[PDB]
Amino acid sequence: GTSQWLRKTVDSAAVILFSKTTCPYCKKVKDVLAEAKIKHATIELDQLSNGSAIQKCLASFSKIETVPQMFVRGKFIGDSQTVLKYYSNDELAGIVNESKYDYDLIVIGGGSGGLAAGKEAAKYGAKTAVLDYVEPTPIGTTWGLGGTCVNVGCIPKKLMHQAGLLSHALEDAEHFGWSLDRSKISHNWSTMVEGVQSHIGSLNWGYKVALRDNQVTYLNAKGRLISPHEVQITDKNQKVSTITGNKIILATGERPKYPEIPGAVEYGITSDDLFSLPYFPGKTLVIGASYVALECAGFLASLGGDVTVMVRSILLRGFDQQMAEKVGDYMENHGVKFAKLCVPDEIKQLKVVDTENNKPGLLLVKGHYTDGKKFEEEFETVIFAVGREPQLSKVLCETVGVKLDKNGRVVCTDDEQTTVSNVYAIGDINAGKPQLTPVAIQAGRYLARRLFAGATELTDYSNVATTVFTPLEYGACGLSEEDAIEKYGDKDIEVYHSNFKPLEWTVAHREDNVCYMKLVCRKSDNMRVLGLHVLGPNAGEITQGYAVAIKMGATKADFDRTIGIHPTCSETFTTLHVTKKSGVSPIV
């Protein structure tokens, strides 16, 4: 029924007004609340299909059936006359601030999702605290508010990716008639790092301002859920206390793993350290083969570093393997070396990091290949990118009763709820969800709208598009080719594909047949597009809009009947015709 919607809304909301748009009785209660510096949500009943039934159900609480009606934290406050009887008597602040807990909402985690949920909750009148603390890395690195993307993730990595792209810009400029000689131009690592850290510092500051201007309490404190409604916090001075909240959101993210081998923690670094490193890495070994490892190797080479990637098995496990091979081939051709089917055994120190003179150390790496032969080479810097994990034992006492999966992530329902009914989890620690910043933001915002404004919208987690920012970018939306075959059978999968060449590469004398795209389609379902894949420049900008068409169920015919924009790389999707079954070449 409607009755248990209405009654979840009233129960959970902080301050909420049931109202209508034509009623000037409601319009005067609003203006009172605005000037009184009171935030609230507002269900306009004349714009809901079944506003009539809701008016009746309000009477179960208030014994009346008209509008406006104001509730605070589950209790009916009054109608239009009673609100002004409280206002002019100056009894209104004591009533709107009445609560069994310190906060309506405590977010443990000040990253992508944490800050996004906190700000949206506060819009609708919820008393909100946001906790953030950055445990330092083994060598001591630390940073400010905003989470992993803002400080040591998407933002600093794409900015260094852009710095790497601009070396090809300097090469190309010669052929388009500019008088520079790229031969005599070199890169300065620490000038880059200063500009990058300057931008991050402005996001740190901007988030503190945003929280302040939304009346959100920010505590730079480590938090721990000790009971369903109690969060124990620790100061920067080591002072412990306890705060209480009605709803809890866990949004604490992950940190990089190290392999269990001698020397790794003591002498290597991870991505957490790379984006503010005060010396150029020098001769670098990257261990691992995820998108983090290949993206960092890619711009290290483009800035002129001597870069090696040690690969256990394959590149980009979980991604379309034909495209992953195309990515790796391009990198191998443009400076990155690979040591294939190889694994490390220990890291030995030969020289200590020189802090005063700003120089890396010197390390000796010992490893072995799957056949048996030995790996032994010296590097100045060794970077581990062997995956990320959460440490929920630090965040969450086991007696609270929040269930975790065998990987240590939180098992949630489809509306982010944990096994404890007032506790939710969003972002990287939610089991089974894609680990991406815009996913966490969308989840956090939609959930706050459900707890405090009566919203029903859920987050849709399927067919979320991605881009890997390797020297040649790789964008994808949907199934990889081998997953669609495995799920529907090779006879039911048709794949259209083609090479291409950006117009911008013609005068520049770049390669003819390295850029590549394909559509993986289901025959028996009107050639429905199951996955889209593209290797080339600006692959993120290319892929993104097609994610809407695929969310709507696009078919091959939908692509055929749409006309291209000329000249672009993206238009090549609108005229594809060569099937893989056919055996015809895809070259240009």
Place this chain on the structure above:
Amino acid sequence: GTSQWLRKTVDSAAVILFSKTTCPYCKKVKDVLAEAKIKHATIELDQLSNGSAIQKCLASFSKIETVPQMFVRGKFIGDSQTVLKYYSNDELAGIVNESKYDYDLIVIGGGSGGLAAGKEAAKYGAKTAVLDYVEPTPIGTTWGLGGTCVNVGCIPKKLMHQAGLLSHALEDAEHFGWSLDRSKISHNWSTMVEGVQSHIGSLNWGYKVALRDNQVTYLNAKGRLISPHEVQITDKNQKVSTITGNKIILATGERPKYPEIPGAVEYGITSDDLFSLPYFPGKTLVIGASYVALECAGFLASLGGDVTVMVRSILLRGFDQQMAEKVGDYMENHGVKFAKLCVPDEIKQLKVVDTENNKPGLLLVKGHYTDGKKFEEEFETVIFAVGREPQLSKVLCETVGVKLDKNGRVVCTDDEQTTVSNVYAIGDINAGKPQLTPVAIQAGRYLARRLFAGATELTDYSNVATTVFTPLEYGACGLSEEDAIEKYGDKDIEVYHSNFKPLEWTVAHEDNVCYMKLVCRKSDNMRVLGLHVLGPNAGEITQGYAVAIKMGATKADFDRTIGIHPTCSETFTTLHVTKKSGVSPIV
């Protein structure tokens, strides 16, 4: 119903075979035709939903109801025994070349649409000729096969744009840590033009190879339609002759206009001349305000030139006017000067063009502003971008009966047919269609499939997306904002909008110049009627969304899709400020 399809299909097809995939007798006839190099179309009756009706209806032509049946130019040739008999007896080649006309298809015009139409028809066995001739510009400029885009349009204009974009990329490089100093780097015009002309030459060559390998006859001759089936050709040696064809496609495009003022033809140039000009233009006056005018003024500025645009009234007439003003404001902050509400009266010559030393001349331009005040300035080069027109009197005798609208364009039904039943028109001269290269290509290809392979798919001309390649690009798909209010009323229109800033612009040091909006319809589930974005890589951004708009996308379809981070395009997935709210769109 099905009946009238199969009679239209049999009459216009050149060589066509009706068959079934599972039939070894049809396979036997296919294998004979491959070996004899006899190109043909093929209808596979067992993959069509009314193949049974078609099968019975073939008997009205062939007095049989079995497959495989082969036709040539409206005549039943036989079943598998009759065809093999012809093969074995050496009679099959003469039968399949029997024609009342010289060609199954004559295309007049070897540009974007004509080449696409020509190459596609040949795949189905049509005996095809393609005609192309380039009348020179007033100063003598001419070029090779491929049309306006390939030679004096999209392809050279975007390479030159690209040259201009690299100048800001050299600036940005310093801030991201590269040692270069932008201040001591300069641009060589003739080096660029050589690289551009070299790529165009490779396209000229590749199209000639393409026509050769499809057995299309290429005649570098001017063609004129003198009767429904007769095309008069004139040689590069002025030899005149007449060829005949069953179906005629007109695809002759347009050329730039000149204003009727003294000195304009004698001392100015147009875009036709600019992309192969041997000298740098110098101080340039661009007259006009279309996307050609603004794109060219744009890269000439970025390459270091002193550039002025003379605007009669507004910029980008017919495009969303708020977006056009943003496009022009950005150009004005980055070098381009504007002479607003202004029109030219005459061009006077001060220095002739110096061919020996490779230098432009010198000109005095006189004009007036709308209030009467006078304009008088000196420039080395004057570029007219005051529109384009067909000249179908050069193409089409009046007595053939092909009807034209009041602009001289061809009035066509929604299958590209003219008032004469064997004559079709495609591309720029098709009245009322967006004048774009992918549109011409799609129309020429789809039409050839209907004339010669029994296809029925029409070309969809609605909601075709565009990009204007100004220094900051402007992508668009669907109705402008003012157009949508005119059609549905202000109360039924919601506009969501936001400024944004590329991540690449942060370390490189404007905050709120990039902009995008969605124009929606309240009473139709908030249906997206127009998408607009100003920013970098706007074509790459806009294109994919054109599929979702074609499928009828709403605001909720945009909200429920997750973004790709960090990108510019992802800002479309989280828009929330409305124009009626009065809230500011900056970030």
